[PDB]
Structure formats: structure tokens, C-alpha cells
Amino acid sequence: NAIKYLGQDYENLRARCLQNGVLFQDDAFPPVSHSLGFKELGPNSSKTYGIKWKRPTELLSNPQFIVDGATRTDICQGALGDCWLLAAIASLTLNETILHRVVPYGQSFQEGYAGIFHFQLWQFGEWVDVVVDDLLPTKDGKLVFVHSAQGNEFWSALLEKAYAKVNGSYEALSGGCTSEAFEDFTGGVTEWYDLQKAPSDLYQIILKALERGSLLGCSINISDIRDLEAITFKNLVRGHAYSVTDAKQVTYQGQRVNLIRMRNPWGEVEWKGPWSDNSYEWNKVDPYEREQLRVKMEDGEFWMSFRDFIREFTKLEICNL
Ligand SMILES: [Ca+2]
Numbered sequence: 001n002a003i004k005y006l007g008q009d010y011e012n013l014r015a016r017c018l019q020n021g022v023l024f025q026d027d028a029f030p031p032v033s034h035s036l037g038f039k040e041l042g043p044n045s046s047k048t049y050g051i052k053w054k055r056p057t058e059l060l061s062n063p064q065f066i067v068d069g070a071t072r073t074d075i076c077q078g079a080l081g082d083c084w085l086l087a088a089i090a091s092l093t094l095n096e097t098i099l100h101r102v103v104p105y106g107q108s109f110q111e112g113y114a115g116i117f118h119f120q121l122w123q124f125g126e127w128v129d130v131v132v133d134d135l136l137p138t139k140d141g142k143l144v145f146v147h148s149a150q151g152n153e154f155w156s157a158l159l160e161k162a163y164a165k166v167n168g169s170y171e172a173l174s175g176g177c178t179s180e181a182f183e184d185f186t187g188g189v190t191e192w193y194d195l196q197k198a199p200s201d202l203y204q205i206i207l208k209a210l211e212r213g214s215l216l217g218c219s220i221n222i223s224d225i226r227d228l229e230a231i232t233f234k235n236l237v238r239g240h241a242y243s244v245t246d247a248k249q250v251t252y253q254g255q256r257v258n259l260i261r262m263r264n265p266w267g268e269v270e271w272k273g274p275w276s277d278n279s280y281e282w283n284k285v286d287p288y289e290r291e292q293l294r295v296k297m298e299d300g301e302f303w304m305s306f307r308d309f310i311r312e313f314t315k316l317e318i319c320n321l
């Protein structure tokens with residue numbers, strides 16, 4: 001159904017490992033120092049001290065590939081600057097067709113387990129099947145890189161590992177563009193919008209894009225490297241990729257106001273201005289709209305008015321199907 005990346009056939013390798021009663025060891029990505037990195041995640045980096053590569057079966061008694069669906073809450077960034085990738089994975093979960101292309105069925109830690117997992121990505125104008133063993137970087141029994149809000153869920157950790165494999169190391173994923181990951185999941189071309197010169201119908205473009213299941217992301221541009229990952233006063237993170245997850249209207253002070261929802265791939269650190277989780281604006285909207293849209297939780301997800309969105313964020317990335 002897809003091209004076998006590096007000649008590695010999932011079905012055949014899984015069958016050979018299951019029948020012989022052995023766990024898969026990926027010869028294309030060894031569980032070593034080079035696979036972590038060379039500088040930021042190099043052997044001399046403090047972030048790598050004490051890292052041990054362990055399979056999820058060694059971490060807890062009941063490891064699961066997917067728990068309560070493969071959703072955006074399953075994407076919580078670790079000790080790596082791969083927000084671009086993670087923002088893309090979070091956006092990917094909002095479209096069932098794209099999610100089920102990238103993450104194949106029948107993968108688990110119970111029946112059919114052989115220490116091997118696979119994902120499908122778009123590479124060189126075609127879908128490719130990438131395999132990985134389940135040895136993941138851990139420190140004191142906890143995942144160092146991406147993890148789920150659900151402690152025993154490992155799909156997102158394994159997808160990020162597949163990306164690290166394709167790119168050579170986990171560090172090769174530090175610093176990038178959301179656009180590339182969007183393209184790796186759809187085979188489309190991402191369009192950039194300058195929010196300082198935003199077209200008059202941008203909200204309508206966003207609404208139609210989200211309804212079709214397109215992948216959307218946003219960020220605040222930086223001029224220098226020292227202001228990278230810097231926090232704004234209203235708690236937004238600069239030079240950091242966010243996933244745009246919804247766009248809905250609410251009745252506020254007798255008028256229908258345009259709102260937009262985004263998610264920080266850290267799974268925490270949210271906007272604290274108007275329309276934020278604990279903001280007073282929600283008290284003035286009717287009970288139903290309040291209960292359907294607002295979720296008071298430190299989950300990385302929040303709402304902003306479209307007026308504030310275009311004043312704060314500087315770039316919007318939309319990848320259509
Ligand atoms: Ca989940």
C-alpha cells in the first residue's frame with residue numbers, strides 16, 4: 001500500500017519477530033548517543049545525563065498504543081525544540097482521514113506485539129511506511145521527549161521517534177517549520193499568511209479550512225536568536241509553533257464576535273488576555289456557548305478574539321487537502 005522506507009517491511013519484520021519470539025531491534029536507528037544528538041542533545045549536554053533507552057513494557061505494567069483516541073491532548077512537548085512537528089501532529093488528529101493514513105490500525109502492546117511499530121509519511125511525492133522499534137529515551141522512568149497527558153499512552157512518542165529516525169537524530173528535529181510536517185502528513189503545499197497584512201476575509205478562509213479538515217498553525221516571528229521561546233506579557237511564546245484548532249462565534253454584548261482556538265504543543269502555558277480560560281468575557285456569553293467552547297484546564301489550549309489574534313500572532317500557515 002506504500003513504499004517500504006529503507007527496505008524495511010513492517011508486516012514481514014513483525015511476523016518474523018512474532019513467530020521467532022523475539023523483540024525487534026531497529027538497525028537503521030540504534031538506541032545510542034548519536035541517535036539523541038550532537039550538541040543540544042549531545043553526550044556532553046546536561047539534558048542527556050542519565051538517559052536510558054527503554055521499551056514501554058519496562059516503564060509500567062499496562063502500556064497502551066492508543067488510549068481514549070489519538071487526540072491533541074496526547075501531544076505534550078519534551079526536552080526538544082520540535083514544536084513545529086508537534087503542532088502539526090496535534091492538528092493532524094482533527095482530521096480522521098489524515099490521522100488514519102499516518103497512524104495504521106492494529107498496533108498494540110498486547111496481541112501481535114513484537115517491539116515494532118509503523119507510521120506512514122509523505123516523502124518524495126509518495127506515501128512511505130516507516131518502522132521503529134519501541135526503545136524510547138527515558139530519564140528516571142519518564143519519557144524525555146514527547147509524551148501524552150495520559151501516562152500509559154505511547155503513539156505520539158513513537159511517531160516522534162519515527163521522525164527522529166527519518167531525520168538522523170532527535171536533535172535534527174530542533175528548529176523547523178510547521179509547513180514541512182503539514183506537507184509530510186498530507187502531500188499538499190502549505191500557504192503562508194502575513195497577519196500584519198491580513199486580508200479582510202481571513203476569518204472566512206480559516207472557517208472553511210477548518211471545516212474541510214485542513215491543517216492550520218500559527219506563530220509570532222522573531223528578529224534575533226536570544227528572543228527564541230521568549231514569553232510575552234500575556235503568556236504567548238515567541239518563535240514557537242501553535243496549532244489552530246477551532247474558530248467559532250459567540251454572542252458578546254449583543255453582537256456575534258469572532259473567536260479562534262489554538263493549542264500550545266507544550267500542553268501548558270496559555271494566553272492570559274481576553275477570552276482566556278479564566279477571563280471575565282465568558283461570564284457575559286450565554287450558558288450553552290460557554291459550556292460548548294470554554295474548558296477551564298491547563299491543557300495548552302485556549303481562545304482569543306480574532307481581533308487580538310491578528311494583533312499578536314504574525315504568521316498563519318494553512319495546508320489544504
Ligand atoms: Ca489519547
Ligand SMILES: [Ca+2]
Nearest residue numbers: 297299301302
Ligand atoms: Ca486551556
